[PDB]
Design a protein around this ligand. Structure first.
Ligand SMILES: [Mg+2]
Ligand SMILES: [Mg+2]
Ligand SMILES: [Mg+2]
Ligand SMILES: [Mg+2]
Ligand SMILES: [Mg+2]
Ligand SMILES: [Mg+2]
Ligand SMILES: [Mg+2]
Ligand SMILES: [Mg+2]
Ligand SMILES: [Mg+2]
Ligand SMILES: [Mg+2]
Ligand SMILES: [Mg+2]
Ligand SMILES: [Mg+2]
Ligand SMILES: [Mg+2]
Ligand SMILES: [Mg+2]
Ligand SMILES: [Mg+2]
Ligand SMILES: [Mg+2]
Ligand SMILES: [Mg+2]
Ligand SMILES: [Mg+2]
Ligand SMILES: [Mg+2]
Ligand SMILES: [Mg+2]
Ligand SMILES: [Mg+2]
Ligand SMILES: [Mg+2]
Ligand SMILES: [Mg+2]
Ligand SMILES: [Mg+2]
Ligand SMILES: [Mg+2]
Ligand SMILES: [Mg+2]
Ligand SMILES: [Mg+2]
Ligand SMILES: [Mg+2]
Ligand SMILES: [Mg+2]
Ligand SMILES: [Mg+2]
Ligand SMILES: [Mg+2]
Ligand SMILES: [Mg+2]
Ligand SMILES: [Mg+2]
Ligand SMILES: [Mg+2]
Ligand SMILES: [Mg+2]
Ligand SMILES: [Mg+2]
Ligand SMILES: [Mg+2]
Ligand SMILES: [Mg+2]
Ligand SMILES: [Mg+2]
Ligand SMILES: [Mg+2]
Ligand SMILES: [Mg+2]
Ligand SMILES: [Mg+2]
Ligand SMILES: [Mg+2]
Ligand SMILES: [Mg+2]
Ligand SMILES: [Mg+2]
Ligand SMILES: [Mg+2]
Ligand SMILES: [Mg+2]
Ligand SMILES: [Mg+2]
Ligand SMILES: [Mg+2]
Ligand SMILES: [Mg+2]
Ligand SMILES: [Mg+2]
Ligand SMILES: [Mg+2]
Ligand SMILES: [Mg+2]
Ligand SMILES: [Mg+2]
Ligand SMILES: [Mg+2]
Ligand SMILES: [Mg+2]
Ligand SMILES: [Mg+2]
Ligand SMILES: [Mg+2]
Ligand SMILES: [Mg+2]
Ligand SMILES: [Mg+2]
Ligand SMILES: [Mg+2]
Ligand SMILES: [Mg+2]
Ligand SMILES: [Mg+2]
Ligand SMILES: [Mg+2]
Ligand SMILES: [Mg+2]
Ligand SMILES: [Mg+2]
Ligand SMILES: [Mg+2]
Ligand SMILES: [Mg+2]
Ligand SMILES: [Mg+2]
Ligand SMILES: [Mg+2]
Ligand SMILES: [Mg+2]
Ligand SMILES: [Mg+2]
Ligand SMILES: [Mg+2]
Ligand SMILES: [Mg+2]
Ligand SMILES: [Mg+2]
Ligand SMILES: [Mg+2]
Lengths: 129, 143, 150
RNA sequence: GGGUAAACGGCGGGAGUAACUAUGACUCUCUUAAGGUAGCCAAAUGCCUCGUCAUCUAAUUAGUGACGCGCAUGAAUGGAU
RNA sequence: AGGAUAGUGGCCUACCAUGGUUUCAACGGGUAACGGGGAAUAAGGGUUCGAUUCCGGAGAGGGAGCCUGAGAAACGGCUACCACAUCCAAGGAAGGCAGCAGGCGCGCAAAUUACCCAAUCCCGACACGGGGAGGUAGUGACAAUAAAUAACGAUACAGGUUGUAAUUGGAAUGAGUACAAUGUAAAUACCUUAACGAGGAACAAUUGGAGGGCAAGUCUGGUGCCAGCAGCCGCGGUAAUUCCAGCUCCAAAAGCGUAUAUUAAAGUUGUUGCAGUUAAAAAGCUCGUAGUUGAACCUUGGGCUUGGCUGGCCGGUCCUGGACCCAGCCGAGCCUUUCCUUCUGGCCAGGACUUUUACUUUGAAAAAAUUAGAGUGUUCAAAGCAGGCCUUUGCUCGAAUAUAUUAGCAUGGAAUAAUAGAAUAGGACGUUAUGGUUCUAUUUUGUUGGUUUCUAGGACCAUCGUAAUGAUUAAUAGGGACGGUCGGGGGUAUCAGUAUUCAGUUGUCAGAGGUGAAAUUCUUGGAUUUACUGAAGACUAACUACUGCGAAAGCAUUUACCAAGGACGUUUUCAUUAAUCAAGAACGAAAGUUAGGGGAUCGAAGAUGAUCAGAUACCGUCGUAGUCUUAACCAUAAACUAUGCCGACUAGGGAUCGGUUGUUGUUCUUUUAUUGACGCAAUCGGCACCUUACGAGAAAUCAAAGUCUUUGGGUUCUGGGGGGAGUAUGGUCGCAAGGCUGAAACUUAAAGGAAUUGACGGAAG
RNA sequence: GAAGCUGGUCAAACUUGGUCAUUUAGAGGAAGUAAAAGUCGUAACAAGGUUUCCGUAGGUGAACCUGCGGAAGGAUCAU
């Protein structure tokens, strides 16, 4: 069955981006998906995205600008201490100068760089570059 | 999903599965079964002394054609009988019946080496004197 | 899909986006309730009451008019059945299959289907006990099943 | 003329042959209705015979376990358990 | 309840209950198992080791029991037994090195029966005695540090102003030896240092190699598939780059090789991070408990004020410091319908309440040694924790700091993931709501103590009043209902069909059968053939397909009955009920087993005629089990798509089956509609197919075998070179056949996959 | 207040028996591997001269043969 809606959302974005499409439809939506997309949008990896209300879980239409190399989830959401963030960025990111590991911390969903600024850590949630 | 559990609470399944599957690794299996302790002629030791029973020539395997000159040795520690190759040109004349010889493996760790069939040990010393020292006339056999 | 098959059919109802009554609907939130109670006393299950409502009375959804689901209204008027309706129809089917099996002992297909139906009963009965719809000691007995669905 | 063995019953000999010897998987030869199959054995069935090997004993023509060209074992004249 | 104990406690006793642990692995077994600090290797994650300098435990040949004492179940204390073993005058007596040294034995494997209390500390009545604890030296290539074996000129030549190749010099020095002093408890050694101490500076560097991997010979002699080498591939049969040697050269060097174990290499154990169509490997197929994993949804946004730090602008520069200004990054504090416990003294101190977690931050803790690391010229270094100052009747930096990490403790945060609440309201607030039922008491009226109403605090009980009074969507998850269907899905009866064989009647007459060719076989007693009739069992042709149904195995004559099922349609219903699943179940072709019934046809076995060198094979003729059925067993197949199941996405196209929805120059009902068929479009579900390769793969190939080093949607099973071997053994199921589970010894350098060229084929063109 | 005595308690050790575990002998039997390519044939690889293979059951000097049901990994993606 459907065990992770975030994995489905990011997989759909990856498949649409690899084929050169400039838009992708995501179903279902969720708070975690929207806040994950906001982090991607803030760093310019996607454009404007749209939420469609159907009196259900919802749908999202995302505008892609071709800058996204890969976005993905990390299943399961491992617990990450502040000292463990370095190991995750080494394994997941292509370089030390760009790319982001997305975490869910009690201070909110944020990239690994923002998490270091406010000195918080949570569970790993995904990555983008 | 790659055929293995990924859940955060599935450490027991992952740990047990690896434990079950390391038995397919013969290096791991031989270490825990203690096969060297139970089955190996040396009992897990690197070397072993013994008494020369007889000097025997062993025909090499094809395509080689030679007489590999070995000895039959009964180990002192456990009484087992093994065949040990006596290396170098003419070192069989340094080894006599009822001599005490120190043995060692061929370096293939329990397997036969080269064309020599069924021989897994080599003679290192005879009568307490290195076989290499005898071959190079550095020392003389005490007799 | 299809818990006990390989089918993957997607056919189902598609509720309209609007959660309000249609403009042409003239019945009051009460008249539907006495209509629901009237059919419930005739012995109709909540599924059949809803079918009669849309087929002959224009009640598209009882919830968008009355404010409550059909089974919720029956429970408020003491008309809720002891066994939940879907569990009742599963037990009735298992009784029918088991009665056919005793006369056709070589029907190995029906024996296979009975295991599916009874497994489906136990999974549903297990759910109803955790939500305290059925008593914690409620158990489905093949021997005494005919009494419940009499 | 045909059928029938859970009818009565029956169920073979002689030589040669494998980079020592022994044996004979193999081949030749006479011949039957068929040539003893699965099994079992010096057995209550083996003459030679107190057969040969092992075990049991200080010592065993006894006992048991093996072997089997078996004078003359063997399948409802039932075989082996 | 007692007894006992220093004391708690089934620690023991009496009586009484029947409990306690367990697939989250109890219990039992193994350990070549003392635990930890730690060690080796290590990109990360890990793997292996830890008898052994510190901490804890246990033991003193094996058990057991005790005395003394604060403390022992002590063994350099005792008692007894067992096993060893000593002296004996034969009556008796005395033992315990897993302390130091030493001996025997065992073994591949490990040092002196030395000196001393000078240091470190301990013990005692103690400034004084004692200490094989400890220190010192001996042996010590376990490991580790530094570091000699030569340097520089002149000629002669070669050579491109200088690098050498040789024969010619004078210098330098420690290895060693030694006066001596130092060192030390005394010595030894080190450190210093008179005299001695180098030309072949014989004061002489070794260990392995020279085909490849892998650095360095196609030199010379010897042997001739021998001797031997060779981790592996290989070399050796008369010019051996590989053996034995000489020369030369290579590598590391006071070290180098070999054996064994282990770590990396090994993404060949894979959490990070493997593989399962064909190389090893998807359970035959479904159900199913534990386990693992599980749709979405509940304070978001906005406004104002303010603190800090980054860049600068200011510049304010002796790299450096301030408001103002810009942005950026964190923290706040109020207001927005507003969570953030609540009272007293009055953010700290003193009370009353509190859904449970997981996670993460910070703090404390995690002994010293070890690790990382700051300082510091041990002459450098390994180390050590010293040391430094103009030379001191003394001054003076130090001996840091990180890491530990599961568990527990304190703390901040409230995302993510769980959990609880108000549905028969037994719900929440009334701070001073109105009464009622109780329970406890400071304080009196002070001359002390009795009396029960006010009183305050609970805690409840009823009434009343407040309130927006209280139930999230219905997931292109699931389940259920319902409506027309649709199927060679199942069961039980039932009805066909020709055929086969056998039989009865008939007709003729010489052969029939069978084969590549024949023969066995049947035939004038009429075979084969022909027509009619009948009986038995099977089996369901053609229709029949890149079509249908079923979980799979499988399912194909008609009709009836019985109970199922997918898909479709649905503005029906329930609301997470789900996915995959150890254990445990149902079904499971054929063959086979047991007992009845049937036994037409084929036909294992068997018998027979041919062929053949032989064929107890292929071919021919008969033929028993079997083939069919009823009751039971069996549980296996190339049970195959050699491709687990669930979910999402990624590309074009035409067909087709089922359902539904819109529409024809079409045929037909019936004359037309509400007939049906067909045609054209959409759609959901299937069985498949064609093209391409974005993509994958070793390739064959693949719309999944893609979305996989840009590696993580959930989950079950299986594999780890080839054999031995699905064997032995144990267990378990079976009547048996056998099924399931399932090794090891030993052996081996390949076995294997896909494709290419060729060769060959009693294959085609 | 000694020897000694009574009854308890802890209980070594021995004898017998049982069981578990680890080594090891054995007439004979039946395998596997290595060695050499000794005897018999030619089962597989070509349509391997009867296509091969799987399960099962019989038979047979040996490879193997035969029946029943499967598979193509076929010698046919096709009439
Ligand atoms: Mg295995
Ligand atoms: Mg679906
Ligand atoms: Mg359904
Ligand atoms: Mg399921
Ligand atoms: Mg016989
Ligand atoms: Mg006999
Ligand atoms: Mg007799
Ligand atoms: Mg007697
Ligand atoms: Mg006798
Ligand atoms: Mg006998
Ligand atoms: Mg006879
Ligand atoms: Mg007979
Ligand atoms: Mg007889
Ligand atoms: Mg007590
Ligand atoms: Mg008690
Ligand atoms: Mg008691
Ligand atoms: Mg250990
Ligand atoms: Mg031990
Ligand atoms: Mg230790
Ligand atoms: Mg030990
Ligand atoms: Mg200690
Ligand atoms: Mg001792
Ligand atoms: Mg003792
Ligand atoms: Mg003691
Ligand atoms: Mg002692
Ligand atoms: Mg002591
Ligand atoms: Mg002594
Ligand atoms: Mg050294
Ligand atoms: Mg020297
Ligand atoms: Mg040399
Ligand atoms: Mg050499
Ligand atoms: Mg050489
Ligand atoms: Mg080289
Ligand atoms: Mg070597
Ligand atoms: Mg080769
Ligand atoms: Mg030569
Ligand atoms: Mg030469
Ligand atoms: Mg390794
Ligand atoms: Mg692999
Ligand atoms: Mg294969
Ligand atoms: Mg395979
Ligand atoms: Mg399968
Ligand atoms: Mg969720
Ligand atoms: Mg105050
Ligand atoms: Mg420490
Ligand atoms: Mg902690
Ligand atoms: Mg729904
Ligand atoms: Mg229906
Ligand atoms: Mg129709
Ligand atoms: Mg059809
Ligand atoms: Mg199907
Ligand atoms: Mg199972
Ligand atoms: Mg069957
Ligand atoms: Mg029968
Ligand atoms: Mg028959
Ligand atoms: Mg014949
Ligand atoms: Mg035959
Ligand atoms: Mg026939
Ligand atoms: Mg039968
Ligand atoms: Mg199988
Ligand atoms: Mg197939
Ligand atoms: Mg398979
Ligand atoms: Mg499965
Ligand atoms: Mg899929
Ligand atoms: Mg259609
Ligand atoms: Mg490629
Ligand atoms: Mg294709
Ligand atoms: Mg396909
Ligand atoms: Mg293997
Ligand atoms: Mg080779
Ligand atoms: Mg090939
Ligand atoms: Mg044991
Ligand atoms: Mg052949
Ligand atoms: Mg042939
Ligand atoms: Mg053939
Ligand atoms: Mg045959």
């Amino acid at each position: 069955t459907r065990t992770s809606v975030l994995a489905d959302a990011l997989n759909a974005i990856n498949n649409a981006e690899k084929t050169g499409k400039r838009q992708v439809l995501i179903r279902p939506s969720s708070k975690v998906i929207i806040k994950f997309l906001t982090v991607m949008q803030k760093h310019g990896y996607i454009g404007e995205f749209e939420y469609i209300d159907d009196h259900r879980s919802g749908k999202i239409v995302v505008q892609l600008n071709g800058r996204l190399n890969k976005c993905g989830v990390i299943q399961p959401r491992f617990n990450v201490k502040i000292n463990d963030i370095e190991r995750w960025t080494d394994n997941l990111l292509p370089a030390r100068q760009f790319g982001y590991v997305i975490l869910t911390t009690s201070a909110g969903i944020m990239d690994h760089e923002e998490a270091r600024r406010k000195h918080v850590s949570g569970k790993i949630l995904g990555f983008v570059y | 999903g790659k055929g293995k559990p990924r859940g955060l609470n599935s450490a027991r399944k992952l740990r047990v599965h690896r434990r079950n599957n390391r038995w397919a690794d013969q290096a791991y299996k031989a270490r825990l079964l203690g096969t060297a302790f139970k089955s190996s002629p040396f009992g897990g030791s690197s070397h072993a002394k013994g008494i020369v029973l007889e000097k025997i020539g062993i025909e090499s395997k094809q395509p080689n054609s030679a007489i590999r000159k070995c000895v039959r040795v009964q180990l002192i520690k456990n009484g087992k009988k093994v065949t040990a190759f006596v290396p170098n040109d003419g070192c069989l004349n340094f080894v006599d019946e009822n001599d005490e010889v120190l043995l060692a493996g061929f370096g293939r760790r329990g397997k036969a080496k080269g064309d020599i069939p069924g021989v897994r040990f080599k003679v290192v010393k005879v009568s307490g004197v290195s076989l290499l020292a005898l071959w190079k006339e550095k020392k003389e056999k005490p007799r | 899909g299809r818990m006990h098959s390989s089918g993957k059919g997607i056919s189902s109802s598609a509720l309209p986006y609007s959660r309000n009554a249609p403009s042409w609907f003239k019945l009051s939130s009460d008249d539907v309730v006495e209509q629901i109670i009237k059919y419930a006393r005739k012995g109709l299950t909540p599924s059949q009451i809803g079918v009669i409502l849309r087929d002959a009375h224009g009640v598209s959804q009882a919830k968008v008019v009355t404010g409550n689901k059909i089974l919720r209204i029956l429970k408020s008027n003491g008309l809720a059945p002891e066994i939940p309706e879907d569990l009742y129809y599963l037990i009735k089917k298992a009784v029918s299959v088991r009665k056919h099996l005793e006369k056709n002992r070589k029907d190995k297909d029906s024996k296979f289907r009975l295991i599916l139906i009874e497994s489906r009963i136990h999974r549903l009965a297990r759910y109803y006990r955790t939500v305290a719809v059925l008593p914690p000691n409620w158990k489905y007995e093949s021997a005494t099943a005919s009494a419940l669905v009499a």
